[PDB]
Design a protein around this ligand. Structure first.
Ligand SMILES: [Mg+2]
Ligand SMILES: [Mg+2]
Ligand SMILES: [Mg+2]
Ligand SMILES: [Mg+2]
Ligand SMILES: [Mg+2]
Ligand SMILES: [Mg+2]
Ligand SMILES: [Mg+2]
Ligand SMILES: [Mg+2]
Ligand SMILES: [Mg+2]
Ligand SMILES: [Mg+2]
Ligand SMILES: [Mg+2]
Ligand SMILES: [Mg+2]
Ligand SMILES: [Mg+2]
Ligand SMILES: [Mg+2]
Ligand SMILES: [Mg+2]
Ligand SMILES: [Mg+2]
Ligand SMILES: [Mg+2]
Ligand SMILES: [Mg+2]
Ligand SMILES: [Mg+2]
Ligand SMILES: [Mg+2]
Ligand SMILES: [Mg+2]
Ligand SMILES: [Mg+2]
Ligand SMILES: [Mg+2]
Ligand SMILES: [Mg+2]
Ligand SMILES: [Mg+2]
Ligand SMILES: [Mg+2]
Ligand SMILES: [Mg+2]
Ligand SMILES: [Mg+2]
Ligand SMILES: [Mg+2]
Ligand SMILES: [Mg+2]
Ligand SMILES: [Mg+2]
Ligand SMILES: [Mg+2]
Ligand SMILES: [Mg+2]
Ligand SMILES: [Mg+2]
Ligand SMILES: [Mg+2]
Ligand SMILES: [Mg+2]
Ligand SMILES: [Mg+2]
Ligand SMILES: [Mg+2]
Ligand SMILES: [Mg+2]
Ligand SMILES: [Mg+2]
Ligand SMILES: [Mg+2]
Ligand SMILES: [Mg+2]
Ligand SMILES: [Mg+2]
Ligand SMILES: [Mg+2]
Ligand SMILES: [Mg+2]
Ligand SMILES: [Mg+2]
Ligand SMILES: [Mg+2]
Ligand SMILES: [Mg+2]
Ligand SMILES: [Mg+2]
Ligand SMILES: [Mg+2]
Ligand SMILES: [Mg+2]
Ligand SMILES: [Mg+2]
Ligand SMILES: [Mg+2]
Ligand SMILES: [Mg+2]
Ligand SMILES: [Mg+2]
Ligand SMILES: [Mg+2]
Ligand SMILES: [Mg+2]
Ligand SMILES: [Mg+2]
Ligand SMILES: [Mg+2]
Ligand SMILES: [Mg+2]
Ligand SMILES: [Mg+2]
Ligand SMILES: [Mg+2]
Ligand SMILES: [Mg+2]
Ligand SMILES: [Mg+2]
Ligand SMILES: [Mg+2]
Ligand SMILES: [Mg+2]
Ligand SMILES: [Mg+2]
Ligand SMILES: [Mg+2]
Ligand SMILES: [Mg+2]
Lengths: 64, 96, 52, 76
RNA sequence: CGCGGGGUGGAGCAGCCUGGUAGCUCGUCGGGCUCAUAACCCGAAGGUCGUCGGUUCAAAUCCGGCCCCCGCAACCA
RNA sequence: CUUUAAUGUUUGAUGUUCUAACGUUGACCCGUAAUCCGGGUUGCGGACAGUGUCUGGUGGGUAGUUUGACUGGGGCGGUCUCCUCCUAAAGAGUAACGGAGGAGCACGAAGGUUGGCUAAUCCUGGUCGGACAUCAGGAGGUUAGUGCAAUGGCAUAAGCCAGCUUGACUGCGAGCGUGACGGCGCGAGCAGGUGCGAAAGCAGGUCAUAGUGAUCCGGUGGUUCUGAAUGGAAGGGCCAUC
RNA sequence: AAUUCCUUGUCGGGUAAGUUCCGACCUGCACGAAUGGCGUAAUGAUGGCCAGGCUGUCUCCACCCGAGACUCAGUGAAAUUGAACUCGCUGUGAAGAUGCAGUGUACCCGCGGCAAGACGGAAAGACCCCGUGAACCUUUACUAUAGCUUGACACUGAACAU
RNA sequence: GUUUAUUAAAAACACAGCACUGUGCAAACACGAAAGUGGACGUAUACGGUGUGACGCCUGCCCGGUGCCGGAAGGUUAAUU
RNA sequence: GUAACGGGGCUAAACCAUGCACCGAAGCUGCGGCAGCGACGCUUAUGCGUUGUUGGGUAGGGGAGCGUUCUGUAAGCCUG
RNA sequence: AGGACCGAACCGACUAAUGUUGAAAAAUUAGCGGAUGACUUGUGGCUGGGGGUGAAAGGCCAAUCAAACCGGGAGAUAGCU
RNA sequence: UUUUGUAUAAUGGGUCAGCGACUUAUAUUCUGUAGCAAGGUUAACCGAAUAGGGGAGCCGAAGGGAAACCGAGUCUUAACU
RNA sequence: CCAUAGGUUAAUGAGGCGAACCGGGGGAACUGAAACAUCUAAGUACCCCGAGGAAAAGAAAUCAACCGAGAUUCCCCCAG
């Protein structure tokens, strides 16, 4: 039968133009007042998945 | 996505966004595809007939990709600026 | 962690607020600071309010 | 025992050495105090991290009455 | 966080209970009295009546924010 | 409005009484050859009891589980995250139940800037006043200070005063450093808008390095982004935040 | 002391000599009054101790009688087994050697015996640890839950009061 | 007397006796989704449970804790409304 | 059980100093053979006159093969 | 008269040696306890698996018991060999 | 075989013969190879029919953004050197 | 009292067995989640009742989206 997508993974990752994956950064959820503005700002934009854990992501999302 | 007992990359990261239902019923049309239709007139229905867009498509966009040679009359469809220009050059017409 | 967190709200009328910490035992009086409201794009007065 | 603890290593020290051509913004030294002082075309960070403010070559030198190590950047 | 109830001489409790109003149990001192500690009386020191503002002639008594103590159920990643 | 009385009648509770549901493991009759069961007559009880649904309590009676790791075997004890030093072999890193110490904050000024200033300790003299307050002067030269551990810094002071203030700004960010990654860190400059200064300038928290917690699930505020026929809305998203 | 760790407590009795036993003392680590206290005749394949009788239990074994063992005839297993042309010693060695090194000794093959070694055979150690095993048991572990119990509504009605 | 059939026969269990406690009979309690059955064709001098364990002398103080029994003035408290 | 040179034995066959010999390995060389990997140049049957070098190997990765039963090729071919 | 005594059958099973690939998957010989009782035994019947039964040892429930046996879920799962 | 390491006195095998362990299905990804190529390919099904039809679909030729939306750009921001 | 319950006849039908498939009533656990309780396994195994050659379902108080489609079942898509 068809491979099932890891649905959590689907929620967290979007495949990009060159076949990478963007994700929202961790740590910008709560406990914010203590985090510096700068840090928060840096966390805001979506970022590419690293070369190391790309494989895992791919495994999770076969249909991507 | 099992990294030993460590919280795996997807569980580590926040979920984001939502899936739009309006996005599933939108379509993207290359200029190269305007030749494949018949009569030189481009409606949604005509596109469907041609088998370019798909049946469950309410909204369609014409994009500057490929090129159009024949004069073409685009009817009730969104056209990007470059694509519009290309159509004009070809000798076409765009009406809403 | 006796220092409670508070929310400085703009007098400009915008929903914008800064957040910060305040020791309420030593400083009972309300905190007023002229801070930059990014929505109005002006330096407006930000009075203290509860984090809620 | 009351002794098993020690903090994670901070990977300090000179990152770019004498004569080494760097891009502007490149960190030259991570340090605790001003063990090295910022000379010409080198900026000092908030944690006393020395970084290039211009592209060029790192130049360590001893300068001043207190005989302090100054890092300057010379343009190529 | 939501709701309810309280902060009253040194302590707890009445006076709030729809303003015109500091009493109760002790505690302390002094006097009388006893062999007397006591029992008992007389006399007195001791209260922004949680805090502040408002309605009003008049509030601890009505209300608003704020602070603290307690109770309440509630989920709590 | 505070406070009750009068005349007229709609849910509470608390009894009294009754009978017609219901109960009867009371008596007699019948099906019937029958201590079952049913029907009848009758007495007692009686809207209670008892059952169903919902509900609070109790509930090892029963069940499913659970009950960490490191560890010079295991248990017991200790430890688990973060910072400083040493171990660490002059780049970085580097282990042990190796040797020593700290943190789970604080501060609307202890932040920003402009202007000014320079410490410990000792000796001598000096009312109360003494080893030790406060005042002089000399020696002294940072042996002091750093809001707190340790290390590295610090007179251009990062140490100590005073004036005026919110840059403890919003959007960004070349380029680096450090991590397996999640991440964490440094950052000139650009746009907007601000403060201090005559001006050059400096200011995106604090001398630096601890002071912290991913995701999910929720809470509050903003935002026409979305809105299951359409208009709305709910819910969701995005930004802020708990 | 079925309880006393220290402890073979101390004193006495018993014995030539008594960590046991009996009697006391009390200094009860840590008895104690129906998870009974203290007595107690009788009973006990009950625990401990002492004495008489008796004895091969022993000093210290001897002989004899039978059943095996031994030889012949007939039948005829088993555990075990990588292969073996299967010595000693000293050393070495995955750290205890028939097998390696050095060395010594040893003609080939039975039978009766013995059991020191073959880390001999018999059971994938029962001890110990480990496994995000198992099971049962436990409780004021968590979550449930049968049962017991509370109320509301239902089956369930009528008057009359307070 | 009984017991670990097959390593434990005992000081273990049982025992008559004692005590507490529940139980008023459609009994308590038990087996039963229930009907019903046991208790018992018994009825408090009876039955169940618990402990103790012939007999003799006896059985002391503590109700703070955990249970259990009684109490309901207040506080708190579900479904319901 | 000698048992603390491996043994015999040794006054050197021990030790120190200098030298020249020789033995000594699957090291290096010699001759023959196979294979991989690169060059350069042929003029090809996509490999060849040649020329360097490499070829211990567990986990493991890559490449090329043998053989077995069965299907086609096969009512073919071998086989009393 | 007697859960009286001694002692055969009968019921047991304390010691012992033997046996331990046994004559026997618990026996033997020598001794041993009860032996009119809470005895023993035959035949038949009832109690069923989180269930029975248990003078209680977690005993026993067909040489199996801290949850029988047989089939099924089932090729459970096994970071282990 | 397992091991840092086994002649090991660590595991396993008395011997022989036969059997005895990386499979299959469906998805997905990369490599080779063949087809066609800005196109490629059909599925069920029709069709006695491995033909041919069938292009429903799928994948590809455009991305950016949470999304509306825009589009060789786009998101970010009031705006980007 | 009538009646009713009951009773005696008479007729017709039923009973049980049977592989799988089907509808309904009940309904696990191991297992996966690298523990485990929500969840998973799975409405699976199993138990029970009823039927037929098939069963079940079925002629919109159905979808859809302002255009329209036109009962059920079954297959491929939609789509992991
Ligand atoms: Mg958020
Ligand atoms: Mg963890
Ligand atoms: Mg189509
Ligand atoms: Mg009865
Ligand atoms: Mg349990
Ligand atoms: Mg452990
Ligand atoms: Mg240990
Ligand atoms: Mg170093
Ligand atoms: Mg070094
Ligand atoms: Mg200054
Ligand atoms: Mg300062
Ligand atoms: Mg400071
Ligand atoms: Mg500091
Ligand atoms: Mg979670
Ligand atoms: Mg709508
Ligand atoms: Mg004792
Ligand atoms: Mg003695
Ligand atoms: Mg004695
Ligand atoms: Mg006792
Ligand atoms: Mg007692
Ligand atoms: Mg006793
Ligand atoms: Mg007896
Ligand atoms: Mg044999
Ligand atoms: Mg040896
Ligand atoms: Mg022999
Ligand atoms: Mg032997
Ligand atoms: Mg022998
Ligand atoms: Mg052995
Ligand atoms: Mg084992
Ligand atoms: Mg018996
Ligand atoms: Mg017996
Ligand atoms: Mg036995
Ligand atoms: Mg015995
Ligand atoms: Mg007893
Ligand atoms: Mg008593
Ligand atoms: Mg009590
Ligand atoms: Mg009491
Ligand atoms: Mg009570
Ligand atoms: Mg000797
Ligand atoms: Mg050679
Ligand atoms: Mg060679
Ligand atoms: Mg050679
Ligand atoms: Mg090789
Ligand atoms: Mg070689
Ligand atoms: Mg007798
Ligand atoms: Mg007898
Ligand atoms: Mg006998
Ligand atoms: Mg069972
Ligand atoms: Mg036991
Ligand atoms: Mg048995
Ligand atoms: Mg079980
Ligand atoms: Mg299964
Ligand atoms: Mg198996
Ligand atoms: Mg093996
Ligand atoms: Mg080992
Ligand atoms: Mg070897
Ligand atoms: Mg071996
Ligand atoms: Mg051997
Ligand atoms: Mg082993
Ligand atoms: Mg074999
Ligand atoms: Mg073997
Ligand atoms: Mg594949
Ligand atoms: Mg391919
Ligand atoms: Mg039938
Ligand atoms: Mg489960
Ligand atoms: Mg389970
Ligand atoms: Mg599991
Ligand atoms: Mg039908
Ligand atoms: Mg219509």
């Amino acid at each position: 039968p068809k491979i099932k997508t890891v649905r959590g993974a689907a929620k967290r990752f979007k495949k990009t133009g060159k076949g990478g994956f963007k994700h929202k950064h961790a740590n910008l959820r709560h406990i914010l007042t203590k985090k510096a503005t700068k840090r928060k700002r840096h966390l805001r934009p979506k970022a590419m998945v690293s070369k190391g854990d790309l494989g895992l992501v791919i495994a999770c999302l076969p249909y991507a | 996505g099992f990294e030993g007992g460590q919280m795996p990359l997807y569980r580590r990261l926040p979920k984001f966004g939502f899936t739009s239902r309006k996005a599933a019923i939108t379509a993207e049309i290359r200029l190269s595809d305007l030749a494949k239709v018949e009569g030189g007139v481009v409606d949604l229905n005509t596109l469907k007939a041609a088998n370019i867009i798909g049946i469950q498509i309410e909204f369609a966009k014409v994009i500057l990709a490929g090129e159009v040679t024949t004069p073409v009359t685009v009817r009730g469809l969104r056209v990007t600026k470059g694509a519009r220009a290309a159509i004009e050059a070809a000798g076409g017409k765009i009406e809403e | 962690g006796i220092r409670e967190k508070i929310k400085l709200v703009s007098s400009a009328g915008t929903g914008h607020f800064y957040t910060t910490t305040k020791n309420k035992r030593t400083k009972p009086e309300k905190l007023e600071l002229k801070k930059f409201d990014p929505v109005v794009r002006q330096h407006v007065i930000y009075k203290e309010a509860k984090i809620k | 025992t009351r002794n098993g603890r020690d903090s994670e290593a901070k990977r300090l020290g000179v990152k770019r050495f004498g004569g080494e051509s760097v891009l502007a913004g490149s960190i030259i030294v991570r340090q605790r105090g001003t063990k090295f002082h910022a000379g010409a075309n080198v900026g000092c960070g908030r944690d006393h991290t020395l970084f290039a403010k211009a592209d060029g070559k790192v130049k360590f030198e001893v300068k001043g009455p207190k005989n302090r190590k100054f890092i300057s950047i010379e343009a190529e």
